[PDB]
Symmetry: C2
Subunit: 247 residues, 2 copies
């Protein structure tokens, strides 16, 4: 059975003081890390502070990684550097980076390749827009996005997929847990056909739409939803209840 | 003007190499009231680097968000930098303009965010080989500088960097004389846009290839106030580059 995977994407939020308060509350939750993956993704400059405050039961990662290796790439953080610091996970292809920083499918591929080369675990995001869904292009879009990078996966425990329903993020539309489930099943089928049956049954596929204390249980109970990449709710002490839903 | 020597480590370093390097740096006795010496490590290396370096060394980061706090996965806001007392930011480095399509408008917005949050900004610009061969150096640099220069309200807090892109990875070499002329041109641009007192106050650093051999010939130029140093700043011999400014 697939190990559930609950992730906190803090995005560009936090102070030293707020993180101290939040991590303390997180540490009060007793869970078994051998049965459940719980991963926190602070801002890069907060990583050291965050890692030191969180008990080891929480895994940690960064919100982005360079497509380039070490060298003359001012402002970038390489996979090699992340590995040397024992940073376990990286987020790749978050829709915000695709949107504001024009990250492409090829950038995502190259980031994944670098991450795996340096023995990092990767949380890889993709998903279709409102226009794409309205044109009935969900499967076509996700197929292309997944096929951009899927052949790079060797160990299907170490790459975790995230479906972001962009059509339901800042559009006024909302995704039901069932509608998420339908796409998740479709994603798993794509992995099945591009990679293999065993591989597909192994891979974690997370929901990356709006997740809160009220809807997390309805989401996690869906057969092909293996967890979540959680936004604003993960900046709240009540995030522990979101973790509880996967326990 | 107070000389300014900056180590741009770019995307380089390990916990162990930084331990070794910062230790060698600490061995240099300099007066931080006489010259600024700023180290720019990778974001995830900032805490390690700040802790290891003695208080005489200033520190910064190699990039900052044009956006504030919020839903900008992967970005570091000026607000976050301020909360950590990260003193300096590099803005507009040609590598970010090249690989990440950072624009003049991006540079302006990043400068604005930085100043709003009391960050000191090291702002980079420079012309390509094609632009120089077409005698567009002044035109190009004027446009790049004018993208942001009206935001400077304190001329100690913004530091300019001329990157001779025409002499970076092209096989071409910039002489200290050539660098000085551009710096002179840049200071005149700042005079035209901000005033004489302001132009005479602002640091303008050389961002071309700087090493232990050439550093003195560059900093002794009238309008070159220091450097943003690249791979030479990953060496223990970087102390000798600092010495050229002492």
């Amino acid at each position: 059975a697939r190990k559930y995977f609950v992730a906190a994407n803090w995005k560009c939020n936090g102070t030293l003081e707020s993180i101290k308060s939040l991590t303390n509350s997180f540490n009060n939750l007793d869970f078994d890390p051998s049965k459940l993956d719980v991963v926190v993704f602070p801002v890069s400059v907060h990583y050291d502070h965050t890692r030191k405050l969180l008990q080891s039961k929480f895994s940690t990662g960064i919100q982005n990684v360079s497509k380039f290796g070490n060298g003359s790439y001012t402002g970038e953080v390489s996979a090699e550097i992340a590995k040397d610091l024992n940073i376990e996970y990286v987020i790749i292809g978050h829709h915000e980076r695709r949107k504001y920083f024009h990250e492409t499918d090829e950038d995502v591929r190259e980031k994944l390749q670098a991450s795996l080369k340096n023995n990092l675990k990767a949380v890889v995001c993709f998903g279709e827009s409102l226009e794409q869904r309205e044109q009935n292009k969900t499967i076509e879009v996700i197929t292309k996005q997944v096929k951009a990078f899927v052949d790079l996966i060797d160990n299907f425990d170490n790459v975790i997929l995230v479906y972001e329903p962009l059509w339901a993020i800042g559009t006024g539309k909302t995704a039901t847990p069932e509608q998420a489930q339908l796409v998740h099943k479709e994603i798993r089928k794509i992995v099945k056909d591009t990679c293999g049956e065993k591989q597909a049954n192994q891979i974690r596929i997370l929901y990356g739409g709006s997740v809160n204390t009220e809807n997390c249980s309805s989401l996690i109970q869906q057969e092909d939803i293996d967890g979540f990449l959680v936004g604003n709710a993960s900046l709240k002490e009540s995030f522990v209840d979101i973790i509880k839903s996967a326990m």
